[PDB]
DNA sequence: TTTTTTTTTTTT
């Protein structure tokens, strides 16, 4: 009744009216040889951070992907969404944060340089909820970065209305998992970044490595593109009044599994409370290493200024003048 | 069959539908630009101890998050919490303390400031009715500030009953990491204090740094937004029965995570046995360094009433007349 | 009205005559003898990779059947599957990637050996077009290995439009075992190769053995011919720009299900990144355990280039001149 | 004007009248006396596996019937039912494999000992010509032993064209239990073994006992005469390559539905890869505890060799030295 | 007619 025994014999006819047949159906673009499909090539949006961005290996995030971020008690893994929202958003582009922990504060996220009239936050109580307001946000608008943050606490709904301290085994991942597989497939054909800022918990029974995993389940972590981990709670003492104060935490940013470029390519940040991820103070440490400002334990010796051995280093005239920039980026390049 | 290949085009229209479609089903306010919402502007509500209030940065507990306190055998943990709750009933809310150690005198309470006949004590056995008792309260009612003390003692359900010496793996945090998802994701409808005092508990095997913990687990102090530590055990003898014994104790309260201003700011804080927190001897220190209150070894030199150096120092005529403290609390603002 | 007693005496009148009743409606292929039969025997493609080859024992995977390939998180069971299609594309013949996780970036693809315009790339939304692209590839045309990745990313279409967190029970594994019943018969009739790469999650309650399991369902394993589980995560830190970084990963393929050979003969791997799997310095060591190449900790003593103890060892000289690889692999068999 | 009530007296004459009338149209041999039909003493063949042998309590597969087999992921339903074709075909048998998953290789078969030139293989696509391919095999000829494997793959012809995933309910089921009952009420007048090797697959709500049915329908085990269930994937190492490496699996076979002799009287067996089901392995345990071998640590006391404590106990001289077998396997009786 | 997914430390 139909066609006979289908030996290999590679006819371009018998390869190219099947290449007609399944697109009568389904479009012109949904099978196409992969040098003609431009779209591929991974579009990179940065960061800020020179550190994240030459660690990262591609220069940014991977655009079309997800990220996620976590680390142990307060060391900043809101900080470095809240600078990448004000890169994507510095450049043209309408970013929309939702919260979970109602952490948010608005007055300090706009010193750090993300804009107050163009965050489309919202406040969701459960994830049944929480997960669908990106959802139609990214599958019909043409927004740039979305982010969720603690993804520990998109609490699931048949848990919100119940008693305290009963089985509901698996009740949170069940949820994760398929809000998954139902959001992130439906990205790449926006490509726009989507960051879940996760948390850190420990298990029970280990003789080996790793007593700290992360909430949510694994589905999480198989899906998502480049992950980053953020430790380290080292302080610095600067010249604040004069004398010795708390003014820097010092933390470590190692990226673990990446899909565009080698991982496990760690970085070294600092952070000023209250100013947020300081870039200019982040760039002496790795114009050092290239040797473009000379480390010198009395006399910093190259150009802009004749810095000495002080705290403001370069700081007290390029975040006078501006465009001096644009010359050290693209050459540590 | 649905809309196509969604290209970036950043339409208006084609987000506005979306901000109007997703608005059907979860009302006027569920996602609004951060411009507009004004609500997130971080309320404060002042404690009192202007030391402590001035080592938070923004003045005051942040209204409609979560505090710990947590410190070593006998520091007053239970003193300052006490302190808040008057602080927050002075100027028009209703408070109410729970117990769990089964720990707070009420002969003891009523010298502080706060009032006995508006405080709704309970006590409750395990955790089971230990937090829906606040659940019901917080989310239902418009109550200001409510506290759990002690929760290394709120026993989980399944060994209430059980013999001694069983094997009961993490049913602490297993039953805390569930309870905070339940309660601390409706605290901002509200804006409420809520806050729980800790025990300080130790680990075995250790090489880096800290060698004391806190039990109830990871996820207590994820969702906290602002810590306080207390620790300091030296006494102080002043002319009590115009003899040397023992009047004061003198602890020192140190900041360890803040969401809304520097951390690591430490105060200084006197305690005297029974009276409470002092105020008046907190002032005077405080009061010298911007030198308002005149140090010297002989004369205390400026206004108020000609101090010298006795022990009573200011408190002998400001506890006497009021209207002294406005223009002294406002001006080291 | 019909015929009698069917008493058995085996005159070959009595099924010949069956043997040619049957074949004037079914063609002249439906029912042969088997030694008669050369297209039951197996024919075998490789995978360049020589360690498989010697642990599939066979020497590839057997045409006309279905291996399946799964390990834990970032495992390089994307890797694998790309070398296989460099593989099946180097010795004549087409080959079409299809993605689900929309994870292949062809800049990586590039730098193994798989060409670029001779790759038929796709982008399903759900599963519904996710395997009928297969069915119809397959069923008419001449393609030699055809992959599909992550089948628990091949979401079906009757929840692609519903909310989040509903009932949905098995309707993955109600796609997959319907459709693998269609496609994975129709398959050796022309004799290409299909794998689709897998992922792992956990069960609940469990007293025996393993408590990682894979998705789609029990469907997958059954008709799979041909089983791979690819585990592993330590290091080896190379000679990166004369420093000690990290260059190497190292995972461990073991072979779990077989049915051309025996099992469980596992092999050993190295990968570098960027470079994809590293034959060259992966035929050292199973050049080692045959002394061919004599190993010592001072002196590489044996023939082709007196290699010494860098760790470019073989690669300095084999990289540089071709042909010493033929006669090597057919002096191992 | 017919006959008037038949009054019950049993006259002889009133009896053989009617056993004279149903005959002259219903051939002779339609109804007769139990007593003397001879054909209905149950012809038993034997099925290699001696455990098996005296698991099945009368020695074998009895004849006329159908029996079927299952068991989970890679435990040898192949390899008895290749066992038994052997069998069968070593005592002046022909008999006709046919296949469903296109997976019998003939080079492993061929090691076991069922011969390559007289095997007549089928390769259906759908199991309407998957199913009527054994009808006017069994019905017409004399063949003694056909087997169809995996139920689960004689797809019906109505969804070899449709599309993925559709209302298709049944429909597997509405073709098996009516080709069933086309077929096997006609194997009890030629007395020829068919067996039907299945899969397994697991029901969802479940409170007692059972998850894991067998798909197909439930029409095929009423009408089937003996089951077996044939789990375990424990290994065992022998002295392969004078090393402690995997070389032997061992399952476990168990008969839960027979129709001539009672139960639950499971067996053991052990398998080598490659060269089948061992059965001089199977013959030392089945020996030992009716002590034909003493079961000593140290030293196999009996007769055949002066076996001591090695790892081919008994093949050491019996794979080489015949007719020790038969004064054994009658002996066992 | 077919599975889907983990969760939490305790103490010198
Ligand atoms: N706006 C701010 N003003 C002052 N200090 C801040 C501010 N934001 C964060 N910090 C502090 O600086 C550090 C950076 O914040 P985070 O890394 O986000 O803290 P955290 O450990 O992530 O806890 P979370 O996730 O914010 S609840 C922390 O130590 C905070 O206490
Ligand atoms: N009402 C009171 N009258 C007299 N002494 C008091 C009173 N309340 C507290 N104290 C003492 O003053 C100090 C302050 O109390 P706390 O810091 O609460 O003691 P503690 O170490 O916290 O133990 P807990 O948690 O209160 S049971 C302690 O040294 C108490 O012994
Ligand atoms: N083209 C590439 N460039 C740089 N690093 C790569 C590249 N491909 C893979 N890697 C890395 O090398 C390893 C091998 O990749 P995979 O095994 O495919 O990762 P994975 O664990 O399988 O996760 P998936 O399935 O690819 S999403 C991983 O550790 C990757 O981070
Ligand atoms: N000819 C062979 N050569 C080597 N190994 C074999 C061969 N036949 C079977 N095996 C292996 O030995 C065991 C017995 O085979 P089977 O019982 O057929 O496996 P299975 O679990 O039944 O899967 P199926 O039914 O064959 S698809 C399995 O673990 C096979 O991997």
Same mark, same amino acid.
Request: charged residues 30%; aromatic residues 6%; without cysteine.
């Given at each position: ?96 944060? *939702? ?33 669908? =307001?990106?959802?139609?946000? =990214? ?83 198989? &899906? ?28 470590? *940013? ?37 040797? *473009? *400002? ?5 006399? &910093? ?33």
């Amino acid at each position: 009744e139909e066609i006979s025994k289908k030996f290999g014999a590679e006819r371009e006819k018998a390869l190219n009216d099947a290449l007609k047949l399944i697109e009568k159906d389904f479009g012109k673009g949904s099978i196409m040889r992969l040098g003609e499909r431009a779209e591929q090539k991974v579009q990179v949006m940065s960061s800020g951070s020179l550190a994240l961005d030459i660690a990262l290996g591609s220069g940014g995030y991977p655009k079309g992907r997800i990220i996620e971020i976590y680390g142990p008690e307060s060391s900043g893994k809101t900080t470095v969404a809240l600078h990448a929202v004000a890169q994507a958003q510095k450049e043209g582009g309408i970013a929309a944060f *939702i919260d979970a922990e109602h952490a948010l504060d608005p007055a300090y996220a706009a010193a750090l340089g993300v804009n107050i009239d163009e965050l489309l936050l919202s406040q969701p109580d459960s994830g049944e909820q929480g997960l669908e =307001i990106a959802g139609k946000l =990214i599958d019909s608008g043409a927004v740039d970065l979305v982010v969720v943050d603690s993804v520990a606490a998109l609490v699931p709904r048949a848990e919100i209305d119940g008693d305290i301290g009963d089985s509901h085994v698996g009740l949170q991942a069940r949820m994760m998992s398929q809000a998954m597989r139902k959001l992130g497939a439906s990205i790449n054909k926006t490509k726009t970044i989507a960051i879940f800022i996760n948390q850190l918990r420990e298990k029970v029974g280990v003789m080996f490595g790793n007593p700290e995993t992360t909430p949510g389940g694994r589905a999480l972590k198989f &899906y998502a593109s480049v992950r980053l981990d953020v430790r380290g709670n080292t302080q610095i003492k600067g010249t604040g009044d004069q004398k010795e104060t708390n003014v820097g935490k010092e933390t470590k *940013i190692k990226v673990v599994k990446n899909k565009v470029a080698p991982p496990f390519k760690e970085a070294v940040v600092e952070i000023m409370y209250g100013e947020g991820i300081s870039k200019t103070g982040e760039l002496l440490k790795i114009a050092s290493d290239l040797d *473009i *400002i000379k480390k010198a334990g009395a006399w &910093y010796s190259y150009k802009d200024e004749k810095i000495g051995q002080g705290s403001e280093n370069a700081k007290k005239y390029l975040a006078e003048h501006p465009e001096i920039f644009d010359e050290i980026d693209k050459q540590v390049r």
